[PDB]
Design an enzyme around this catalytic site. Sequence first.
Site, PDB file in Angstrom:
ATOM      1  N   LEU A  44       0.828  -1.197   0.000  1.00  0.00           N
ATOM      2  CA  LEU A  44       0.000   0.000   0.000  1.00  0.00           C
ATOM      3  C   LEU A  44       0.865   1.251   0.000  1.00  0.00           C
ATOM      4  CD1 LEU A  44      -2.964  -1.225   2.154  1.00  0.00           C
ATOM      5  CD2 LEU A  44      -2.637  -1.419  -0.353  1.00  0.00           C
ATOM      6  N   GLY A  45       1.915   1.260   0.774  1.00  0.00           N
ATOM      7  CA  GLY A  45       2.810   2.371   0.819  1.00  0.00           C
ATOM      8  C   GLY A  45       4.068   2.179   1.630  1.00  0.00           C
ATOM      9  N   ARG A  46       4.940   3.161   1.572  1.00  0.00           N
ATOM     10  CA  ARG A  46       6.178   3.160   2.312  1.00  0.00           C
ATOM     11  C   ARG A  46       6.495   4.551   2.818  1.00  0.00           C
ATOM     12  NH1 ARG A  46      11.220   2.218  -1.080  1.00  0.00           N
ATOM     13  NH2 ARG A  46      10.746  -0.003  -0.931  1.00  0.00           N
ATOM     14  N   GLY A  47       6.932   4.640   4.052  1.00  0.00           N
ATOM     15  CA  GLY A  47       7.360   5.875   4.630  1.00  0.00           C
ATOM     16  C   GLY A  47       8.713   5.718   5.260  1.00  0.00           C
ATOM     17  N   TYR A  49       9.274   5.090   8.482  1.00  0.00           N
ATOM     18  CA  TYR A  49       9.301   4.097   9.526  1.00  0.00           C
ATOM     19  C   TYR A  49       8.732   2.718   9.210  1.00  0.00           C
ATOM     20  CZ  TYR A  49      10.654   8.113  12.300  1.00  0.00           C
ATOM     21  OH  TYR A  49      11.308   9.202  12.764  1.00  0.00           O
ATOM     22  N   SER A  50       8.013   2.600   8.121  1.00  0.00           N
ATOM     23  CA  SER A  50       7.389   1.359   7.737  1.00  0.00           C
ATOM     24  C   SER A  50       6.956   1.261   6.300  1.00  0.00           C
ATOM     25  CB  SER A  50       6.154   1.110   8.591  1.00  0.00           C
ATOM     26  OG  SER A  50       5.139   1.964   8.307  1.00  0.00           O
ATOM     27  N   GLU A  51       6.555   0.057   5.949  1.00  0.00           N
ATOM     28  CA  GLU A  51       5.997  -0.315   4.683  1.00  0.00           C
ATOM     29  C   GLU A  51       4.697  -1.018   5.058  1.00  0.00           C
ATOM     30  OE1 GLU A  51       8.520  -2.824   1.825  1.00  0.00           O
ATOM     31  OE2 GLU A  51       9.094  -0.808   1.524  1.00  0.00           O
ATOM     32  N   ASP A 155      -0.235  12.838  15.495  1.00  0.00           N
ATOM     33  CA  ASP A 155      -0.184  12.749  14.036  1.00  0.00           C
ATOM     34  C   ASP A 155      -1.600  12.693  13.419  1.00  0.00           C
ATOM     35  OD1 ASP A 155       1.247  12.865  11.637  1.00  0.00           O
ATOM     36  OD2 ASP A 155       1.620  10.705  11.553  1.00  0.00           O
TER      37      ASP A 155
HETATM   38  N1  HBD Z   1       6.230   6.082   8.072  1.00  0.00           N
HETATM   39  C1  HBD Z   1       5.143   5.320   7.984  1.00  0.00           C
HETATM   40  O1  HBD Z   1       4.835   4.537   8.850  1.00  0.00           O
HETATM   41  C2  HBD Z   1       4.261   5.428   6.709  1.00  0.00           C
HETATM   42  C3  HBD Z   1       3.660   4.340   6.079  1.00  0.00           C
HETATM   43  C4  HBD Z   1       2.950   4.484   4.907  1.00  0.00           C
HETATM   44  C5  HBD Z   1       2.886   5.719   4.285  1.00  0.00           C
HETATM   45  O2  HBD Z   1       2.206   5.832   3.081  1.00  0.00           O
HETATM   46  C6  HBD Z   1       3.487   6.812   4.890  1.00  0.00           C
HETATM   47  C7  HBD Z   1       4.126   6.670   6.108  1.00  0.00           C
HETATM   48  N1  HBD Z   2      -7.816  -0.435   6.182  1.00  0.00           N
HETATM   49  C1  HBD Z   2      -6.605  -0.111   5.768  1.00  0.00           C
HETATM   50  O1  HBD Z   2      -6.311  -0.021   4.571  1.00  0.00           O
HETATM   51  C2  HBD Z   2      -5.555   0.150   6.810  1.00  0.00           C
HETATM   52  C3  HBD Z   2      -4.432   0.910   6.506  1.00  0.00           C
HETATM   53  C4  HBD Z   2      -3.449   1.131   7.453  1.00  0.00           C
HETATM   54  C5  HBD Z   2      -3.575   0.590   8.722  1.00  0.00           C
HETATM   55  O2  HBD Z   2      -2.581   0.766   9.638  1.00  0.00           O
HETATM   56  C6  HBD Z   2      -4.697  -0.158   9.041  1.00  0.00           C
HETATM   57  C7  HBD Z   2      -5.676  -0.376   8.090  1.00  0.00           C
END
Ligand code: HBD
Ligand code: HBD
Length: 328
Positions: A44-47, A49-51, A155
């Site tokens: 879904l994404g990456r930042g 601190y996490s993916e 946040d």
């Molecule tokens: N740093 C994070 O935890 C994070 C994760 C997904 C994103 O799209 C942006 C940030």
């Molecule tokens: N429903 C989702 O897409 C979703 C995204 C990020 C989370 O940390 C928990 C759930």
Amino acid sequence: SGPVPSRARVYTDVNTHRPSEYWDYESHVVEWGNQDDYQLVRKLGRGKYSEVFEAINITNNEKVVVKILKPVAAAKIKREIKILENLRGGPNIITLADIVKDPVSRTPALVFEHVNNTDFKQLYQTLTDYDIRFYMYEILKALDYCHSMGIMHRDVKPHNVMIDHEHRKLRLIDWGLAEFYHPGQEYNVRVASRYFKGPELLVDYQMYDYSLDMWSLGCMLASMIFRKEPFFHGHDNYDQLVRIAKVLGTEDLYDYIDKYNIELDPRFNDILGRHSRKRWERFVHSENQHLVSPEALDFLDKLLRYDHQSRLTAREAMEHPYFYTVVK
Ligand SMILES: NC(=O)c1ccc(O)cc1
Ligand SMILES: NC(=O)c1ccc(O)cc1
């Protein structure tokens, strides 16, 4: 002699009275689950601190979300885990279903319930007056719950609010910046996204509290009701304060920094200027007028205050005439 201290006007001593086990996250022992129970499907994404990944729990065939922590995150992971476990079951709080050790990263992966592939920023510029009120009330439930439990989110933004619009279901996500409120403690001001940063963060005032989340919620509301993304559009953290000052005025800003004995960064002398507070009606136009009511304006006005101590708390906010029309 330096800045004047500040304390939260509510939930001041919730952690002080609790056993150390509750807030001492460093000493928390993690109960690890089976990583093999989860099958990653798509990123879904990456930042920083996490993916985050969409996944399937192969035991029950349910959709889950896996947040794989980057190694940057070291022993701040512990804080997030503790907060999520302390807040689990709470209204509109994202439910942490498991904690596994990721085979590739060799870091913890947090497994959450799946809401939808949809965030609040995907919807929030499109909602009716009723829906704004409804979802704002749902957000407040999450905020009063974590604040009552001695936790500040730090946040709050549209992106951290996951919605299933079809089912009118909401969840406050990403507790990676969340912290335990301890009266008198000085906190890091490098928290929250720029547009949602409270004036306390921008003027370097470290003794902040739960009321930081209330400024952030005010930024969200303003943006929704006025159709302006974001409402305070700073080019950076200094211009962020100038943008706020163009709406709330420089006089109440100087009163705020005077009361707390704060010394503003000299860089502000050249850019801040002199501004009168603008009446909220100035932001009303034919494209957002159906979302603005005297109730919406009075409610917003009581969130967007420089003095963090003079903001409505989450509980007081739920009591506001703005929410009288929401079915409860
Ligand atoms: N740093 C994070 O935890 C994070 C994760 C997904 C994103 O799209 C942006 C940030
Ligand atoms: N429903 C989702 O897409 C979703 C995204 C990020 C989370 O940390 C928990 C759930």
